[PDB]
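Thread amino acids onto this structure.
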């Protein structure tokens, strides 16, 4: 196809939630191979920019500062913050998901650790009034994580893009209006 399933899931979210606007600065976590950043550049235009990260390498994209490393490493955080600088960040987006073993009592804790890391970076860099979109799986830990996001944002929706496989346990929490 011309674009990946991931690209289509974000297009569906932009259609439903209107997160991306011209000139915004966006953080893209678990960016490889680049669908979400490629999509966001079409919305933020050439004057916006993205600071992206993945364990895997990916093709460069004009307007995207891409750092390849393990987001679980405190060091990689430091380097990502170096690319953000004093730019205000209007959206933090995360599509990170772990290598899955196939056993939920193992895969869910691995996945929840990454979205907890994504929320901690959101707390640290997202500007007041900003948005956070994160891939999360149904199951253990989902209720508490959603409650925490609801306490930090003015509006929160749980989206299941039509492009998301019906068999997949994933959903996307879409939060807008980061509270003061
Ligand atoms: C569903 S894919 C991302 C697809 C991407 N949104 C796109 O549009 O191409 C999930 C990504 O999370 C990344 N990931 C998982 N654990 C990570 C970690 N510790 N640090 C950085 N990226 C991680 C993976 O390497 C994988 O590329
Ligand atoms: Hg990275
Ligand atoms: Hg936040």
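Threaded sequence (180 positions):
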């Amino acid at each position: 196809g011309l674009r990946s399933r991931a690209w289509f899931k974000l297009d569906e979210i932009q259609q439903s939630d209107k997160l991306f606007k011209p000139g915004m600065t966006v953080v893209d976590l678990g960016a490889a191979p680049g669908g979400w950043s490629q999509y966001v550049v079409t919305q933020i235009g050439g004057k916006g920019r993205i600071i992206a990260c993945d364990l895997l390498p990916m093709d460069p994209i004009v307007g995207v500062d891409f750092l390849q490393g393990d987001f679980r490493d405190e060091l990689v955080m430091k380097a990502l913050l170096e690319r953000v600088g004093d730019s205000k960040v209007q959206v933090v987006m995360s599509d990170m998901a772990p290598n899955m073993s196939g056993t939920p009592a193992v895969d869910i804790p691995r996945a929840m650790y990454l979205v907890e890391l994504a929320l901690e970076m959101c707390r640290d860099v997202l500007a007041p009034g900003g948005s956070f979109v994160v891939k999360v799986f149904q199951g253990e830990g989902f209720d508490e994580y959603l409650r925490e996001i609801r306490s930090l944002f003015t509006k929160v929706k749980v989206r299941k893009p039509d492009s998301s496989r019906a068999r997949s346990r994933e959903v996307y929490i879409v939060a807008t209006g980061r509270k003061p």
